[PDB]
């Protein structure tokens, strides 16, 4: 579930 | 990290100092919605609460913490410094239409069932309908300064070259979120008649309405 972007 | 997403993110940091420097230099906040910076400032509180769980990049680390500090300055800016300024009569969207279904759209459809991951659909929700509360107040006074439509072009850029990121993404990496892309389909939607004035008029030395 890592979220990479802003 | 691809150069869609690196222009997106460019032209989503210029937005934000377009703004900002606008009001600090006129001292004035005439022609902005309050309401907007208000739903803003809590996409991104609610987005970058993972700064105290995961670290991707000094370059991610670093443009969250700017995102953050200049939303919360714009927000100081209209609410206490340049109050005086501040149209309330004309920056009338009831919010709460957007920040209550928002909320429980989050809770139902998201990735999984925790407090982090809700609270970041919830800001990937909200995002796709922050600008209406600006949108709305142009309609009702009229027109809109050649600054404000500027400010207005690079925000709604932004997202649309994040659609172009996930699509190289799906591509390349075999990446996808559709959460993401849906709200990024309907944030981008919502600037189509701008986009359309922007063209046709702003960018030929006519003025907005
Ligand atoms: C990969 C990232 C892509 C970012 C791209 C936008 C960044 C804005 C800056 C420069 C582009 C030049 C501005 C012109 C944009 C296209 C205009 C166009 O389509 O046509 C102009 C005219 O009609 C022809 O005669
Ligand atoms: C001029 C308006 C530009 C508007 C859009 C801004 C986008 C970023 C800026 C410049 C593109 C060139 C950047 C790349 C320069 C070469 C760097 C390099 O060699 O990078 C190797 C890296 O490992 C490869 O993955
Ligand atoms: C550092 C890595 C690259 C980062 C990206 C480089 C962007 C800034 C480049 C040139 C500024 C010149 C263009 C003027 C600023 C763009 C917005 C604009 O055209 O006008 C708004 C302005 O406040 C009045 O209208
Ligand atoms: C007057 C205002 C009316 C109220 C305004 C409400 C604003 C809602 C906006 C955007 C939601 C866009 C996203 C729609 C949901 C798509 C997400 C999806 O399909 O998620 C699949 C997931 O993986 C399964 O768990
Ligand atoms: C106020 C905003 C108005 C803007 C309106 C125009 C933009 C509509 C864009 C895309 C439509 C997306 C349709 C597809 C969404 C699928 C959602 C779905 O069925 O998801 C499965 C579910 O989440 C399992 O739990």
């Given at each position: 579930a890592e979220h990479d972007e802003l | 990290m691809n150069i869609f997403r690196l222009t997106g993110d460019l032209s989503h940091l210029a937005a934000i100092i377009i703004l900002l420097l606008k009001i600090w230099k006129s001292r004035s906040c005439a022609g902005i919605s309050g309401k907007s910076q208000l739903l803003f400032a809590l996409v991104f509180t609610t987005r970058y609460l993972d700064l105290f769980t995961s670290f991707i990049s000094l370059y991610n680390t670093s443009m969250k913490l700017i995102y953050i500090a200049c939303s919360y300055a714009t927000v100081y800016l209209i609410y206490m410094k340049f109050k005086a300024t501040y149209d309330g009569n004309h920056d009338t969207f009831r919010v709460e239409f957007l920040i209550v279904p928002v909320g429980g759209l989050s809770f139902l459809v998201?990735?999984?069932?925790?407090p982090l991951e809700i609270l970041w659909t919830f800001s990937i929700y909200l995002e796709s309908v922050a600008i209406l509360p600006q949108l709305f107040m142009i309609s009702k006074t009229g027109e809109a300064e050649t600054i404000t439509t500027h400010y207005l072009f690079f925000l709604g850029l932004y997202r649309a070259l994040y659609l172009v990121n996930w699509i190289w993404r799906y591509y390349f990496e075999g990446f996808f979120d559709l959460i993401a892309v849906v709200a990024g389909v309907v944030q981008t939607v919502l600037y189509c008649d701008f986009f359309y004035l922007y063209v046709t008029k702003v960018l030929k030395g006519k003025k907005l309405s």
């Amino acid at each position: 579930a890592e979220h990479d972007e802003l | 990290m691809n150069i869609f997403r690196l222009t997106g993110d460019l032209s989503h940091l210029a937005a934000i100092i377009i703004l900002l420097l606008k009001i600090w230099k006129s001292r004035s906040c005439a022609g902005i919605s309050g309401k907007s910076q208000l739903l803003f400032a809590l996409v991104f509180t609610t987005r970058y609460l993972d700064l105290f769980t995961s670290f991707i990049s000094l370059y991610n680390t670093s443009m969250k913490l700017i995102y953050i500090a200049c939303s919360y300055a714009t927000v100081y800016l209209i609410y206490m410094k340049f109050k005086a300024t501040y149209d309330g009569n004309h920056d009338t969207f009831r919010v709460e239409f957007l920040i209550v279904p928002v909320g429980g759209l989050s809770f139902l459809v998201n990735h999984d069932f925790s407090p982090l991951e809700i609270l970041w659909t919830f800001s990937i929700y909200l995002e796709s309908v922050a600008i209406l509360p600006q949108l709305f107040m142009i309609s009702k006074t009229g027109e809109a300064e050649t600054i404000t439509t500027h400010y207005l072009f690079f925000l709604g850029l932004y997202r649309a070259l994040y659609l172009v990121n996930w699509i190289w993404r799906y591509y390349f990496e075999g990446f996808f979120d559709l959460i993401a892309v849906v709200a990024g389909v309907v944030q981008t939607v919502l600037y189509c008649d701008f986009f359309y004035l922007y063209v046709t008029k702003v960018l030929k030395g006519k003025k907005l309405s």
